[model samples]
Target: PNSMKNIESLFDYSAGQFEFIDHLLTMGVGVHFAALIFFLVVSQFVAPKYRIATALSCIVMVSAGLILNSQAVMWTDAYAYVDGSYQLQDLTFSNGYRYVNWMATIPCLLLQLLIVLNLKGKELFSTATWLILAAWGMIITGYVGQLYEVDDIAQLMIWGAVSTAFFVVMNWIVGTKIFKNRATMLGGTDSTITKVFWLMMFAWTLYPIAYLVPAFMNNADGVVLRQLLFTIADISSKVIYGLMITYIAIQQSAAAGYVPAQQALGRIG
Candidate 1:
C-alpha cells in the first residue's frame, strides 16, 4: 500500500508540476546563451548608423549572461545547503568560478561606463561617472559579503543597494539629453531598433526588482514568497533575457541590408 501511494504521489499534479517547471527553468539557461550568441553574430551586419547602439546593447547582453551564469553557480551552493552536503572545509579561497565572475562583471561594468561617457557633453559624462562609481562600490560590497559565512542579511543589503542604485542611474542616464543625442546620432530610430532597445531596457529593469523580492521576504512567515521571488528572478534573467537577445538579432539582421558586405563585417553596425 505504501509503495502504491508513493507511485501515485509521483504522478499527482502538484508533485510532478514543480519538477517539470524546474526542468523548463533549467533549460532556459541554454536558450539564453544561444540567443545571445545569435545576436552577437547578427550584429556583425548592422547598419553603420545604428551599429554603436546595437554593439553596446550586445555588451549589456554579455553582462546579463555573466550575471546569469553567476546565479546558476550560486544555486549549486543553495542545493548543497538544502541537501546538508555542503562542506566548507573542502572549499578553497582561490576557486576559479569566483575569479571568472569577477573578470566577467568588472569588464562589463567598465564597458558600460565607457558607453555612458561617450554619449556627449562633460556634464552628462560626469554624472554617469559618479553613478558608475557608486554602482561599482555597491557590487564590490556585495561580493565581499560572499566571502563571509554570515546569514544572507549582509549579502542582501549590499546587493540591494547596488542593484537599486544601478537601476536609478541607468534610467536617468538613458532618459536624459545625452541619451537622446546618442539615439539620434547613432540612427537608433532608423527602424525598430529603438523600440527593441527600450524593450530590452525594460526587461533588464525587472531583474533588480525581482532580486529585491527575495530580500524583502526573508523575514516573512511563509517560504512560498521566497520561492516565488526566486522564480521571478530566474524567469526575468532567462526567458525575458532570451527575448531581448532575439529582438536584437532581428534588428541587426534588418540593419545589415544598408551596409557594404565587407564593411558590414568590420563596422559597428
Candidate 2:
C-alpha cells in the first residue's frame, strides 16, 4: 500500500503538532550527544577488558544522535504553514531513519549485555551473532509493518506480529541465557544486571506500543504521542541503559582491582 506515498491522505499537522515534535526531536538528539560526550570520558575508567562495552555505547549514542539530528531536520522540511496549519510539502518525511538508527544501534545495545556477561570463545561469537541477526529481523519486520501503517491494517498487523516474535526471542535470550550468566558476576553487579533486565523490558516495550498507535489513534495527536513515546524509548534504551551497562563494567573493573576503577570508586565513596 506504500504508506510513504499515502502520507498526504492521512492528516495534516497543526502548528502545535509541528512544534511539539520538533522540540521532542531536538531533545532526543540532545540527550544522545550529551550521552556520547559522557561515554567518551567514562570509558577510560573501565578496565581495558570491559571497556569495549562502553565503547559500543559510544557508537550507539553517535548513531542515535546523527539519526535524531536528521529526523529533526527532516520533520521541519517536510511541512509548510498553509491556512493556519502545517501541511505536507513535496518532500517526504520518513520515519525510516529510526529503523535505520535501530538497525545499527540495537545490535550494539544487545551486544553490550553479552559483553558484560563476559562470555568467552565460541559462546561469545555465536550468541552475539544470533542476537544481532534477531535484532535486525525485529527491526526490519517492524519497519515493513510501519510502511503499511497508513494503508493496510492487515499487513501492518501481520508484520508487527512477526516483529513481535523476534522481540520475544530476543527477550528469551535476555531473560534466560543472559540473566543466568549473572551468577558469574561479582557482588553488586548481579543486582545491577537485574535492574538492567527490567530496564530493557520496560523501555523496549514502548517501541511496539508507539508502533501500534497509528492503528488505533491515527491523528495529529497520535503522531505527537508516538514521537513522545519514541523519544522516551530512545533516552531510556540508549542513555540510561548505557549508564547501567557502564556501571556494571565499572563495578566489575573495581572488583578485579583495576587501578583506575578503584580510584574512581574511592573518589565517589
Candidate 3:
C-alpha cells in the first residue's frame, strides 16, 4: 500500500505538467479553427468553380486538426498520473503526441502542396517545396522512431526539430501571403480587419521558437517558461485567429456588393 501511494504521488506530480502543456496545445486548436473560418468566408465570395475546392480543403484540414488535438488531450491525461519526476516518461508521452500530430500532417501537407502547385505554379518548387518536404521527412522519421521504441533523447530531438521547422515555414507563408500582401493570391484585397488579422498571424508564428528555446537549453526551471509560451500561443490562436475568421466572413458578405456581374455566379448574393 505504501509503495502504491508513492507511485500515485509520482503520477500526480507528472500530471501537473499536463495542465500547463494542455493550455499550450489549445493554441494550436485555435489556429486551426480560425483558418477554417477564414476559408469558409473566402469560399462564399470566390468564383463558383473554386468555392468547392476551397471548402473541401478547409474541411479536411480542420478535421485532421481536431483528431490530432483530441488525441493530445488523452495523452496529457495519461501523463498526469504516470510519475512526473521521471523525465523519460514525460518525454515519451510528449513526443508521442507530437508524432501523432505530425502524422496527421501528411495528408494535409499533400493537399496543401497540391493546392500550392495548382495555384502558384512551378514557383512552389523553391524554398516552399523544400520546407514542405523537410517537414514531411521530419514528421515521418519521428513517428518511426517512436513506433519502434527508440531512445527517448533521439525521439524528442526529432520532434523538436520537425515541429520547429514546420511552424517556421507555416509562419513565413502566413506572413508573406496573408499579411504582407493584404490579399490572398487566390483573389482578395486587404481590409482593416485583415490588417489586424495579419499582425496576429505574425505574432503567432513565434510560438514554436518561444517554446523550443527553453526546452533545448535544459534549464532546471524551464517548465514554467515553456508552459507560458504555449499559453500565449494557445490564446492567440483561439481568440485572435477566431476573430480574424469572423472578419473574413463579414468581408465576404460585403464584397458580394462590388464584384462584377460575371464574378457573381456562386457568391453569397
Candidate 4:
C-alpha cells in the first residue's frame, strides 16, 4: 500500500501546472467578453433592424461563452482500488459546464445565421426552427457523450460521432440552399455568409480532431491541448464570426438605403 501516503502521488503530478494554466487561459477569453460588449455598443447603430438582434445574440453568445468555459475546468482526482488491491485515484478532469455552454451558444449562433440570411414567410420561420433544432441535437448528444469512463470509451465516441454528424449535414443543407442561388438567399450579403459559413465549417470540423488529442495523450496533457484548441475555435466561431456577420448587416443597411448615425443626410449639406 506504500503506507497509503502515495495517494496524492497517483498519476504524474508534473502536469498539474497545466491545470492552473487552463484557469489563467480564461482571462484571454475575457477579452472576448470585452469585445462582445464593444461590438454590441457599436452594433446598436448597425442596422435599421439587424442591430437589435445581433446585439442581443452577441450578448448571450460571448458572455455565456466566457461564463460557461470559466465555470469549472479544475483538475480532479478520486480515490479507488484497482481489482480490490492497492488504492489510488485517477487524474480526472471535468467539462460539464463546457457542454451546457454549447447548449446556450449554438442556438444563438444559428439565430444570427438565420437572421442574416433574412428568410421570410413560413419557409423562413420553419427552416430556422428546424436548423436550430438540429444544431441543438448535435450539441446535446455531443456534450453528453463527452463524459465516459475508460471502459466506456466506445460509448462516448459513439455519442460524439452522432452529434458531429448532425452538425455537418445541417450546415451542408443550409449552405447548399443558400449558395444555390445567393441572389435570393442573402443577396449582396452573400459574401459575408460565405465567410461565416466556411469559418464555422472549419471551426466546427476541428472539434473532432481536437477530440482525439486525448486518445494520443494522457488526460492531463489532453486537457491543455483541447483547451487551447477550444479557445481558438471559440474565438473564431463566436467573436470573429459574429463580427463578420455584423459587418454584413452594417453594409446591408446601407444597401437598403438607411443612414448610419455617424453621417446624416442634412449634415452632408
Question: Lowest summed lDDT over 10 consecutive residues: which window, candidate 4?
Answer: 1-10
lDDT of each: 0.43, 0.86, 0.46, 0.62
The true-versus-predicted C-alpha distance at residue 102 of model 2, in Å, is 1.5
Model 2 scores a TM of 0.96
The 10-residue segment with the lowest total lDDT in model 3: 1-10
Candidate 1, residues 132-248: lDDT per residue as tens digits? 564555455544433321245556567566656655665565445334544432223233334434643565455444334434543222123433443454445334544443344
lDDT of 1 at 126: 75
Clashing pairs in 1: 46-269, 51-269
Model 1 regions lying over 4 Å from their true place = 1-25, 48-131, 141-166, 177-179, 182-201, 214-216, 219-257, 260-269
- Give residue 221's error in model 2 in angstroms: 0.4
Best by lDDT: 2
Tens digits of lDDT, candidate 4, 165-200:
888778876787557535643326766677777898
How close is each model in CA RMSD to the real structure? Answer: 9.7, 1.6, 8.1, 6.8
Question: Over all chains combined, what TM-score does candidate 3 have?
Answer: 0.48
- The estimated TM-scores of all candidates read 0.51, 0.96, 0.48, 0.78
Q: Whole-model lDDT, candidate 3?
A: 0.46
* Model 2 lDDT, residue 96, Cα: 68
| Residue 28 displacement (Å), model 4 | 3.8
Task: Point out the higher-scoring one by TM-score: 2 or 3.
Answer: 2
With candidate 1 superimposed using the best TM-score fit, by how many Å does residue 233's alpha carbon deviate from the native? 5.7
Ranking by lDDT: 2, 4, 3, 1
